[PDB]
Design brief:
- The PDB classes it as transferase.
- The structure is a homodimer.
- The first copy, chain A, is mostly beta strands and about 575 residues long.
- Chain A is built from 3 helices and 38 strands.
- The first copy, chain A, folds into 2 domains: about 110 residues, Arylsulphate sulphotransferase monomer, N-terminal domain (Immunoglobulin-like, Sandwich); about 475 residues, no CATH class.
- A 5-stranded antiparallel β-sheet of chain A has the order 8-37-36-35-34, with no helix packed on it. In chain A, strands 18, 19, 20, 23 and 24 form a 5-stranded antiparallel β-sheet that branches.
- Chain A is globular.
């Protein structure tokens, strides 16, 4: 006679590159029936300033992989890797040379600047050299959007006409998923064919790979089209679920709860409107599902919030929304009453009236906090009741108006803001077209305030626009909110992300982690900038600033995560 | 233009037959955006003595399916179905006529008696008319076993020779999976293509569909080849996991624990023997895995029990082992020291020394109880230590001998049994080549004692063989075992199942449920009998006896389950 397996490389088994076939900068040391413990892996830096990557490896992982996972390799390089373990109460060590192959971008055309996205390291403080960031970005396919859901023909349409579309099937794009270190080197890559195939027409492998979040096991969830997933840093796909049959179009977020369920943002297909027309709703439903794919609960936001409120909808940059473009960049969006159902700015179920793009679970009262790009930030209870809302007061009717939070200063004294969220004699401002409204380890609400439609108008000039990191403290009993921190207001257009983006508070080194996904988006002909940032919470000093430039002009990035090797292999 | 969806049948949505495409005797009432509760489904009996099936439907199910599930249809029939619910505090009712298509057996050849397995109702006591049994049986493919794992060439083999086989890849057969009512009618069918494709050579869809067990959600797990699954009675495949890479050949059992894990019975691939030869082990490892497919724990039985112990191995009918001779039927198995590694009777890792075929989790001390066909019944701890053994004393060395349970009568007085398990002046006997060693709702240990190799010999004539249901009571602290119940001893060869089979205690009606999967297996040219039974625990009266006859001669059944519609749709 046959062909023998790879023989052993040292004192354990063979060292296999990319055992699952989805993560070419990983490897695996076959255990070959050895019984070991106390395992530590080190991957050595490339050259003089190269970052070394180091992590322990738990028993579950050794058993799961039947070997020792090797994460952190450089591409096309003779990686030097050390593995240490205990075996029969004796200390053991092996040094391996692990050659790798290349990273491939399978989606290139005349818009391509080059195959990979470029990195520019701007600033790395001391004691931050070891940081790693997983960048969740994407790259245009040659074809663009080729598929639509079919809907119901509306009453007042041509006798002869073909059926309309519905939903958001065209929200579809090739992934570009990697990890970057502080020398700007790629240290991990998730093969684009792991989940996506843009040449075939198998909707099972289509969509927009989004909402990558860690789990209590140090693995990650994600969504893409009409499926959701779980995977690990060796590239093993651990779960793959079709959405339940009533739902479609999962985007933006996926988060595991502590109860072993997962929260997803979807649309409802075959939603019967009060006028009896069926549509696939846009980005306005939430699912709690178990690890079986079954639905544990569903929040239908069309009956909980207000699909008629156009206060923020009418104030937006038509050029944005990810989507994008562009002849109409800068221009304020003029709503129309005859806007056909679809992924379009508008009111009512079957249009993009809410565009919820983040989810967080509050364990303390079994509730969920949501970021609605076009309405504000809300908490809704298990009981399907609104608990509070963080938004400008304009447009809200009762009973919902009554749940708006009242702003207050450090001593708890009301702050005067008009119905557009413009406050006087304060740093306090609300969020507009925001993202990632999550719960910090401190118990506060952190948000990335993108800043389109700030104060419910377009400004006089496009460049008078800014984005903020911002943190709030909320008293639920009293119904008040206090801005306790902010950043970015002063950096102007060069730090403005009209779309996407994220922040998350890091307690380990007291920093605020940021990723601005859409900087310079509207600079026609230029790469879009994804700017990784760690800001000192105390001093506001920049500790890390790294820029990722898109491989094609005018191509937004979605999010990034700060990942930690220590937690990857439990 | 287009084609419209099926219109509404009555007051909800359309009634879709086989929505998921794997269970043709099911249907679904689309919810069409209606908000309902208190759902109850009734499927009417066919004709005069036809059994009616009725169940409630919980909210999770309505949301999961976006509709009301309909279970219990007859094939090729105008099924009459009633659905009742509450909507806007009003009571509601719809009567539907649901036409079905046929059941198909896709695996037929000259051996075939007819396409379906025949049922013969023998006895149905009053108050047992409503019982349903899920039959886990199988049907031969034209090709038989066509595939082997490749192994390592052993030292003392021909220079020119090809590599050997290893493992148990040939354990491969088409499934045949249905639910039968007490009129002997098929009321549910699982499409054979759900998991199996015996004409293609994709090993992902090969194996022996086994170990079907219910879960806390009213769904079922199962194994087949190199994957494990979860499915529900609407035929939705909820989970599908590849085995972890170190393991192969999952058969016999899959059971969800209360900790959200699942227990599986596998072999280990690339197992390094002490002589340095690599093999795939046979049926001698246990995995706890999570819903992510990851390994939580592993029990390697080659280091826990005694792979050298041939006390029972040498006493077996060569005609059995599932697998089936049958030219050497009746004959005693003569072990050889040069038996090449494989699915073969023999000692040591790489042969079938243990043939473990059932697993149970003891939540009281976080341990597992195992049925080893070829060694006996053992409890092993989380700590990988043997806690006790229920078997004849011959062949066991220390430290294991010391864990053997000592038999006792109702007053706790020792019972005298020789090393072969023959007892004097008692009804007490051990189990031989047994199956399903499970924990009843009473806290006792129930077992199907097939009875091949009884008293560690073949009898003088082949028909001097019998099978028992049997229940034991164990004092772990004292190290003793008491037989407290038995049945079938008196029924002789006609109730003898040399292989497979199952029992389980039903507390709802104080019965012992049983399935004899291999009756008349050795009758050349005759269908094999799978006999479903419910025996009154108190009186020993037969309450249900129903016979399933195989669609080809000499083709064993594996198991059946008593299923309860009340629990299927939580």
């Amino acid at each position: 006679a046959g062909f023998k397996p790879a023989p052993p490389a040292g004192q354990l088994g063979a060292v296999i590159v990319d055992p699952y076939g989805n993560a070419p900068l990983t490897a695996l040391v076959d255990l070959d029936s050895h019984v070991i413990s106390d395992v530590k892996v080190t991957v050595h830096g490339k050259g003089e300033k190269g970052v070394e990557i180091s992590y322990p490896v738990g028993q579950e992982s050794l058993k799961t992989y039947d070997g020792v996972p090797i994460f952190g390799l450089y591409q096309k390089f003779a990686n030097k890797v050390t593995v240490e373990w205990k075996e029969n109460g004796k200390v053991m060590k092996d040094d391996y040379v692990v050659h790798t192959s290349a990273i491939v971008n399978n989606y290139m055309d005349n818009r391509s600047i080059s195959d990979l996205q470029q990195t520019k390291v701007i600033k790395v403080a001391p004691g931050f050299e070891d940081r790693l960031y997983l960048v969740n970005t994407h790259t245009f396919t040659a074809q663009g959007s080729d598929l639509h859901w079919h809907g119901e023909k509306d009453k007042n349409a041509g006798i002869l006409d073909a059926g309309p579309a519905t939903g958001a099937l065209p929200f579809d794009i090739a992934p570009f998923t990697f990890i970057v270190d502080t020398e700007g080197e790629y240290r991990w890559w998730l093969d684009q064919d792991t989940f996506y195939d843009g040449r075939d027409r198998d909707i099972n492998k289509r969509g927009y790979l989004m909402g990558i979040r860690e789990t209590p096991r140090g693995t990650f969830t994600a969504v893409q089209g009409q499926h959701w997933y779980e995977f690990d840093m060796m590239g093993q796909v651990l779960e793959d679920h079709k959405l339940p049959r009533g739902f479609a179009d999962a985007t933006h977020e996926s988060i595991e709860t502590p109860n072993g369920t997962v929260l997803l943002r979807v649309g409802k297909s075959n939603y019967r409107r009060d006028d009896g027309v069926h549509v696939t709703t846009i980005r306005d439903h939430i699912l709690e599902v178990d690890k079986s794919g079954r639905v544990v609960d569903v929040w239908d936001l069309t009956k909980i919030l207000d699909p008629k409120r156009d206060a923020l909808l009418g104030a937006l940059d038509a050029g944005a929304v990810v989507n994008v473009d562009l002849a109409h960049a800068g221009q304020q969006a003029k709503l129309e009453p005859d806007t056909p159902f679809g992924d379009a700015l508008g009111v009512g179920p079957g249009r993009n009236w809410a565009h919820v793009n983040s989810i967080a679970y509050d364990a303390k009262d079994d509730s969920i906090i949501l970021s609605s790009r076009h309405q504000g930030v809300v908490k809704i209870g298990r009981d399907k009741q609104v608990k509070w809302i963080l938004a400008p007061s304009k447009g809200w009717e009762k009973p919902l108006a009554s749940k708006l939070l009242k702003p207050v200063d450090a001593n708890g004294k009301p702050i005067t803001c008009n119905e557009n969220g413009l406050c006087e004699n304060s740093d306090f401002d609300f969020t507009y077209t925001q993202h990632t409204a999550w719960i910090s380890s401190k118990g506060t609400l952190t948000i990335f305030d993108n800043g389109d439609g700030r104060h419910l108008e377009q400004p006089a000039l496009p460049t008078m626009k800014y984005s903020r990191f911002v943190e709030y403290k909320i008293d639920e009993k009293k119904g008040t909110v206090q801005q306790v921190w902010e950043y970015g207001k002063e950096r102007g257009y060069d730090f403005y992300s009209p779309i996407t983006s994220i922040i998350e508070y890091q307690a380990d080194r007291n920093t605020m982690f940021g990723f601005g996904g859409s900087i310079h988006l509207f600079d026609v002909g230029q790469p879009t900038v994804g700017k990784l940032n760690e800001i000192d919470y105390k001093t506001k000093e920049v500790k890390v600033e790294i820029d990722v430039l898109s491989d094609k002009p005018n191509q937004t990035h979605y999010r990034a995560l700060l990942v930690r090797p220590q937690q990857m292999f439990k």
